[PDB]
Structure 1
Amino acid sequence: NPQVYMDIKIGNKPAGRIQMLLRSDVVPMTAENFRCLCTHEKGFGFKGSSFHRIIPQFMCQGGDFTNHNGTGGKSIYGKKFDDENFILKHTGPGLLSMANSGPNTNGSQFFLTCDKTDWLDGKHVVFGEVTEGLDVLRQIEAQGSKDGKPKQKVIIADCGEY
């Protein structure tokens, strides 16, 4: 299963690195998309993009590296891609799940959960989990607002795969 990382910067200040395991065994197309967006091996990806929507005790959303507001992003597949399956459930904090705009609209946007969010089960594809740096995810969450607006910008300063 791929392991990938993101170094996070908050306002001016390096916060640390989040390492993530991607569940290619469960959701191969989804895991591969996110992997390539971490390495930029297809010519584009997450580096320098932001977590543009952060809601405390809920989730930190990013991956909109085109419009930086929730309206953009793109998958490696040239088009949005289907929900692969909903086997993995939103059982606690520290999980990777795809943002979308309805069935079969996966692109590059994703969120890291900050609690168990089981009301999203069957609506969003979960595809990975944080293996180190849960505390950096907490620092991201610390910039959140009820309405999602970040108090300071949170940037993926660097990212890649191990």
Structure 2
Amino acid sequence: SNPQVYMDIKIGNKPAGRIQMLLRSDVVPMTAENFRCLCTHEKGFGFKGSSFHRIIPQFMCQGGDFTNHNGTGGKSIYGKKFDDENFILKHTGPGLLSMANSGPNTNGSQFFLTCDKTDWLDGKHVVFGEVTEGLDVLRQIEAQGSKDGKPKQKVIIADCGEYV
């Protein structure tokens, strides 16, 4: 049954609160499992201490690049990259989890949290989960965005894990 995970967010030197997310293992099991493991660090690496390096107001907050911290890095639990499982889940509104990529079948660890309906990404990025608690914390992340995506203050995943 669908995993639930959390990230505790720190903005600048200040704790912002916790985002809780439901992962859609029923629809995209490989994609959900990757993100789950990256929250728990059970495969030896993951999101803790990494940043949201690209934040665009009214669009999305992107993170998961825990190797290069700039959108060029990251890795999945399966290797550097894995296939797009399917595009069943659509970018219908804010608070959705979706995989960042560099073209078809290039999923690694980078992901974004949507801040509005982003339907122009449908069929291009794999949606795999949703925020169940802490939409307000996501809005605090978004508040640090700029049009060119540069964060105004550092946004860090201070802690993360699974409810299990």
TM range, smaller chain? over 0.9
Cα RMSD of the aligned pairs, angstroms, is 0.3
Output one character per residue of 1:102-121: Cα deviation in whole Å (capped at 9) or x when no partner.
00000000000000000000
Output one character per residue of 1:127-155: Cα deviation in whole Å (capped at 9) or x when no partner.
00000000000000000000000000000
Output one character per residue of 1:49-97: Cα deviation in whole Å (capped at 9) or x when no partner.
0000000000000000000000000000023000000000000000000
Q: d(CA) in 1 for partners of 2:59 and 2:66?
A: 22
Give the structure 2 partner of residue 29 of structure 1.
Answer: 30
Give the structure 1 partner of residue 132 of structure 2.
Answer: 131
Shift of 1:38: 0.1
Q: d(CA) in 2 for partners of 1:115 and 1:79?
A: 29
Q: Which runs of 4+ in 1 moved over 6 A?
A: none
Give the structure 1 partner of residue 7 of structure 2.
Answer: 6
SS of the aligned residue for 1:26 comes to coil
Shift of 1:48: 0.1
TM-score (norm 2): 0.99
The yes-or-no answer on 1:87 pairing with 2:85 is no
Give the structure 1 partner of residue 123 of structure 2.
Answer: 122
Output one character per residue of 1:26-67: Cα deviation in whole Å (capped at 9) or x when no partner.
000000000000000000000000000000000000000000
TM-score (norm 1): 1.00
SS of the aligned residue for 2:93 comes to coil
- Unmatched 5+ residue regions in structure 1? none
Number of aligned pairs? 162
- Unmatched 5+ residue regions in structure 2? none
Q: d(CA) in 2 for partners of 1:81 and 1:117?
A: 23
Give the structure 1 partner of residue 78 of structure 2.
Answer: 77
Q: d(CA) in 1 for partners of 2:114 and 2:147?
A: 15
